[PDB]
Amino acid sequence: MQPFDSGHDDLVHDVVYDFYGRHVATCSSDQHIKVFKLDKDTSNWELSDSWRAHDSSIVAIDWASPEYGRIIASASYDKTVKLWEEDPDQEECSGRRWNKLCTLNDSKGSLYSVKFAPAHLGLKLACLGNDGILRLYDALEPSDLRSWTLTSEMKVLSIPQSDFCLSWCPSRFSPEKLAVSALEQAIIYQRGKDGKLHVAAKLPGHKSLIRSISWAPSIGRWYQLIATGCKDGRIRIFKITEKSNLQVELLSEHDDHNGEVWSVSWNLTGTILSSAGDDGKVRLWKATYSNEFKCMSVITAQQ
């Protein structure tokens, strides 16, 4: 496990995996998007392509389900979200191996996050920015991936040192819903019976900026689990059970990091949870028989 050079000039914001974990998408403030592939025989990550995608810092990125094709979405501070699709009729590392499908620019504020909705809800995505407005976009007609409709708008923080996050609920066997974090707030939106979005619940306790929230795959259970990494040094794991209105519990709460917990991610099966922070360490957590989380291992970056 030797590190490789991203090749970015400025700072790298996000790194995201494709469906099979054989590819990775990267975005930096150098206004470039890079895509790497894990060569099967060499087992070394190599550059598939890189290109100038935005006119400002490209903060968030994400892949769409293989089911719809090779599609990547990027959010930038230039108040825009762009959609790209791998055109295999172009050499790799040709700068033109990915084509812009379109540019959604309804946002009037820099964009902080962009996540694709679970494939089982169609080609749908959501983004959040400065304007504290959540926005859902749908490729209503997968026949033509260029036309995306603005499916929804919601004032997450109707009244604006800030951060924003998004994370849909993966489970195909559960009512469409996604989690949103704006500053210190963390609210959940659920698709109402009327087709619109509604604030179904809130994750309380955050004493400062929520740096990262990840909704865990619920393969095997009935309740939902969504973790958050706050600037106040705590990892929090919320248990959302719907009995209908959502019931919210605070399963675990960890401060092991002593400092901002910048990134929280989940396993493929939602069996393992990861946290990273100032302390320059990454901790992994599994759940016990009573559902409290224990830390199973700690990877350091220090020295």
């Binding site: 590190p3 393969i219 991610s265 493929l268 393992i272 291992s297 350091t300």
Partner: protein, 478 residues
């Protein structure tokens, strides 16, 4: 703070001690062995592929996993426990699957040894085996009976567990003890130690190395006889007949009573050294504890020389533990005290730590044997404390296997979920409906096995997706 700690990199780490706390970010990947760490900061543009600590990608493992899965599906209905020969036969086929597991594990252990890679794994595995070796001896041989039912199988298994936990007394130490005469304490402590462990073959060997034929045969003739026909008694320690034992112990005690009150033409010290030797063989608890270095040597001896009845197992454990406490150095000693004392559930967590796999199947076979059982009581999917404890661990291990990236074990994965002793069929359907899209298919055969499961479980949409997928992907090649 709680568990492990490992370098993200050995000679290439990005964060320098006592510097500026930075934004370290980490994303778990669809592949256990392929994750990624990075930093959102200036002049920090390297990506750090990280793999989950203690992950097993070895071939030996996927062989071990497959091998244990056989033993699993082969137990058919015997995988569960129903509440008169159905009982007798059930136990029989289960105590057999247990021996099957021990084997699969011993083979794995052996193969891991041949590869001078991280022997940290070899250690963890051996500990597991010892714990199982104890478990088997105590619950998968006599089936709620007493050592009298099957003496040979029991004593043979007991002596195995004992002389396989720790290498001692290692031959290295035996020859540290062989350099006026061997009327030393070190000799007898070693001699009695071999006796307590059932290592009579070796025991006799130590005697036939010094003082038997010379000092005795010459000095005192009375004790020469005692020491020799006692050696004879060792050469014939009853391992098969519970009756031959009683007769045996009688001759042993008859011998010690004779010597005990007779001509002492030998040292005042050497005199006692032999009476202590004769008392240990007889079963004097007082003395058994005396020459015992660990609680398990005391335990083994009580059963071997005092009274072979698991009705005193609890009383034996206590005497043994007062004499020598539990060594917390090795993760196995405690789980064995826990077995021998009843509470078996508390052995699982420990084994889940040494090896998630072995732990899962150990629970499975324990549920089969009826040693542990679920007590628990909208839409209800289970991968929780709801179904048995064993269910949990197996499904956990199943899920874990899906991120392992080994396509060979994906059937073992889906299999465990399928054959899960409990849990609704529709519950198992949903679970597979989500896990399957992630199968690492390569060949066509693979795609068929893949689709065949969509059929077997009625997953049409899950399959059309599988197709649509291979569709775009294939046309993208034009």
């Amino acid at each position: 703070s709680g568990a492990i700690l490992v370098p993200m990199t050995v000679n290439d780490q990005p964060i320098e001690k006592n510097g500026d706390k930075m934004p370290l970010k980490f994303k778990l990947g669809p592949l256990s062995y392929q994750n990624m760490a990075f930093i959102t900061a200036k002049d920090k543009y390297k990506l750090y592929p990280v793999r989950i600590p203690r992950l097993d990608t070895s071939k030996e493992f996927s062989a071990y996993v497959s091998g244990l899965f056989e033993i699993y599906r082969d137990l058919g209905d015997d995988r569960v426990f129903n509440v008169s020969n159905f009982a007798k036969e059930h136990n029989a086929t289960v105590n057999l699957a247990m021996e099957a597991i021990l084997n699969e594990l011993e083979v794995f252990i052996g193969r891991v040894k041949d590869q001078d890679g991280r022997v940290n794994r070899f250690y963890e595995l051996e500990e597991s085996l010892t714990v199982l070796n104890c478990l088997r001896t105590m619950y998968f041989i006599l089936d709620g009976q007493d050592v009298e039912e099957n003496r040979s199988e029991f004593i043979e298994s007991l002596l195995n567990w004992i002389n396989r936990s720790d290498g001692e007394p290692d031959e290295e130490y035996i020859e540290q003890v062989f350099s006026k005469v061997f009327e030393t304490q070190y000799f007898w402590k070693l001699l009695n130690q071999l006796v307590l462990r059932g290592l009579l073959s070796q025991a006799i060997g130590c005697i036939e190395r010094s003082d038997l034929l010379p000092y005795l045969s010459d000095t005192c003739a009375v004790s020469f006889d005692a020491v020799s026909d006692s050696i004879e008694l060792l050469k014939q320690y009853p391992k098969d007949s519970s009756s031959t034992f009683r007769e045996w112990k009688n001759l042993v005690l008859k011998l010690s009573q004779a010597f005990g009150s007779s001509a002492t033409d030998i040292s005042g010290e050497l005199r006692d050294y032999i009476e202590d030797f004769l008392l240990v063989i007889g079963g004097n608890q007082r003395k058994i504890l005396q020459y015992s270095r660990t609680w398990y040597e005391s335990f083994c001896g009580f059963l071997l020389y005092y009274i072979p009845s698991l009705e005193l197992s609890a009383e034996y454990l206590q005497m043994s533990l007062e004499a020598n406490v539990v060594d917390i150095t090795n993760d196995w000693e405690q789980p064995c005290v826990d077995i021998i004392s009843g509470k078996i559930h508390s052995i699982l967590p420990v084994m889940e730590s040494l090896d998630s796999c072995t732990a899962a199947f150990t629970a499975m076979i324990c549920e089969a044997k009826g040693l542990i059982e679920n007590i628990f009581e909208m839409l209800e999917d289970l991968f929780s404390y709801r179904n048995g404890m064993a269910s949990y661990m197996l499904n956990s291990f199943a899920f874990e296997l899906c991120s392992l990236g080994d396509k060979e074990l994906w059937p073992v994965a889906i299999g465990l979920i399928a054959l899960s002793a409990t849990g609704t069929r529709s519950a198992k359907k949903m679970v597979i409906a989500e896990l399957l899209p992630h199968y690492p298919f390569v060949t066509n055969d693979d795609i068929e096995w893949m689709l065949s499961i969509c059929v077997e479980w009625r997953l049409p949409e899950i399959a059309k997706e599988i197709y649509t997928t291979l569709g775009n992907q294939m046309l993208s090649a034009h």
